[PDB]
Design a protein around this ligand. Structure first.
Ligand SMILES: CCCCCCCCO[C@@H]1O[C@H](CO)[C@@H](O)[C@H](O)[C@H]1O
Ligand SMILES: CCCCCCCCO[C@@H]1O[C@H](CO)[C@@H](O)[C@H](O)[C@H]1O
Ligand SMILES: CCCCCCCCO[C@@H]1O[C@H](CO)[C@@H](O)[C@H](O)[C@H]1O
Ligand SMILES: CCCCCCCCO[C@@H]1O[C@H](CO)[C@@H](O)[C@H](O)[C@H]1O
Ligand SMILES: CCCCCCCCO[C@@H]1O[C@H](CO)[C@@H](O)[C@H](O)[C@H]1O
Ligand SMILES: CCCCCCCCO[C@@H]1O[C@H](CO)[C@@H](O)[C@H](O)[C@H]1O
Ligand SMILES: CCCCCCCCO[C@@H]1O[C@H](CO)[C@@H](O)[C@H](O)[C@H]1O
Ligand SMILES: CCCCCCCCO[C@H]1O[C@@H](CO)[C@H](O)[C@@H](O)[C@@H]1O
Ligand SMILES: CCCCCCCCO[C@H]1O[C@@H](CO)[C@H](O)[C@@H](O)[C@@H]1O
Length: 278
């Protein structure tokens, strides 16, 4: 038997829509997590919430919580190949306020996800993860498709110790395996690019996501909706490592619709995180 490694941490993320010259409504997304690792094994517990930012200070709407348990096993880990596998369980416990005909819901998500890292040359790596999810229970309420596939995979070129370029293909696709179901169906494809910099104890990663294509059909999106015009997004992740097990992270991203017309809604994403490693 080997050593236990532990992490605990907490994050607070905000999403805002910008329209008519100001922040128009936003979500607040507190979360916390704990993880424990030994040899090839890792287990992670987490609790996440998403609801209206000023929900407790007066009023607002639909929120959900999302307790989670994941287990990861590293099959291979070396220089030339790494391969690992996650199994996961979440509950989505929805509380509807906005919604007519809707009340509470509990829908589970089951996850199986390989992750890999393959050396192509001394400078170049092919890496990625791919996840399959099954959603179960309350789907008539939540409107989700029963199955989903998601992957980010691509190439990493390392310049030297301080800088690396990564460029990835991203896909997310919701579909129904049950012929009877037709809700929640969508597809999103992007290219994503990152320039992670390691400057002493600071980590700085500017990045961009370039929309390739997206569509959602009838059910999906905003109940009474479902769209299909693609977004660009630019962001910056900043990390700081205190060298005593403590680290903090700050993230900011801006997203707009390259679509044509007059104006259209934009989106801001911000996050602050803390991790303690022992
Ligand atoms: C801080 C800068 C404020 C500039 C104000 C311009 C933003 C207007 O964004 C608004 O998005 C709406 C959603 O479709 C459009 O319908 C409005 O016509 C548009 O003005
Ligand atoms: C679980 C991790 C801790 C997160 C709590 C950090 C403090 C959150 O603070 C919240 O900020 C909101 C705006 O974002 C305000 O609307 C709320 O009134 C305020 O409680
Ligand atoms: C880091 C460790 C996180 C564990 C937190 C577990 C919290 C489980 O709390 C869950 O909250 C939901 C509220 O909608 C309910 O639907 C569930 O019945 C309830 O068990
Ligand atoms: C800079 C942020 C890049 C996000 C890339 C998404 C794909 C992640 O891919 C991951 O790369 C890791 C190397 O860092 C490997 O350890 C993992 O096995 C691999 O799944
Ligand atoms: C570093 C070794 C594990 C890499 C992560 C593989 C697990 C895939 O998990 C994925 O994590 C993503 C963030 O990467 C989330 O965006 C995805 O929704 C989640 O499915
Ligand atoms: C390092 C380079 C990263 C960026 C690659 C972007 C490739 C964009 O690709 C294009 O994107 C458009 C999105 O509206 C589509 O309409 C085009 O048909 C699609 O081919
Ligand atoms: C730090 C440099 C990144 C700048 C990104 C923020 C500026 C994006 O601004 C966006 O530009 C788009 C393209 O012209 C317009 O369609 C959007 O209306 C506008 O909000
Ligand atoms: C998501 C996590 C899935 C775990 C998949 C199986 C991992 C454990 O299985 C592994 O460990 C031993 C049994 O303990 C076997 O003898 C090994 O050969 C096997 O690789
Ligand atoms: C991602 C790291 C830096 C991102 C900075 C983006 C902040 C842009 O924010 C602003 O950009 C304008 C374009 O000038 C938009 O039209 C404004 O409405 C928006 O608030």
């Amino acid at each position: 038997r080997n050593d236990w490694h532990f992490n605990i941490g907490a994050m607070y993320e905000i999403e805002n829509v910008e329209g008519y010259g100001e922040d128009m409504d936003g979500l607040a997304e507190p979360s916390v997590y704990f993880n424990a690792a030994n040899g090839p094994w890792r287990i992670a517990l987490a609790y996440y919430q998403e609801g209206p930012v000023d929900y407790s200070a007066g009023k607002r709407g639909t929120w959900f919580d999302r307790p989670e348990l994941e287990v990861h096993y590293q099959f291979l880990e070396n220089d030339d190949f790494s391969f690992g596998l996650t199994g996961g369980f979440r509950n989505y416990g929805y509380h509807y306020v906005d919604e007519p005909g809707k009340d509470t819901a509990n829908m589970q998500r089951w996850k199986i996800a390989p992750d890999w890292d393959v050396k192509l040359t001394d400078d170049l790596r092919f890496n990625g993860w791919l996840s399959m999810y099954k959603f179960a229970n309350d789907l008539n309420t939540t409107g989700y498709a029963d199955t989903r596939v998601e992957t980010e995979t691509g190439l990493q070129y390392t310049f030297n110790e301080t800088v690396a370029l990564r460029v990835n293909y991203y896909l997310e696709r919701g579909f129904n395996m049950d012929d009877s179901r037709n809700n929640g169906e969508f597809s999103t494809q992007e290219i994503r690019a990152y320039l992670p910099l390691t400057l002493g104890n600071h980590s700085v990663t500017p990045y961009t996501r370039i929309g390739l294509d997206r569509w959602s059909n009838w059910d999906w999106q905003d109940d009474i909706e479902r769209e299909g015009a693609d977004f660009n997004r630019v962001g910056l992740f900043y990390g700081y490592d205190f060298q005593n097990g403590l680290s903090v992270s700050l993230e900011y991203a801006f997203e707009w619709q390259d679509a044509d017309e007059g104006d259209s809604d934009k989106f801001h994403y911000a996050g602050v995180g803390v991790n303690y490693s022992f």
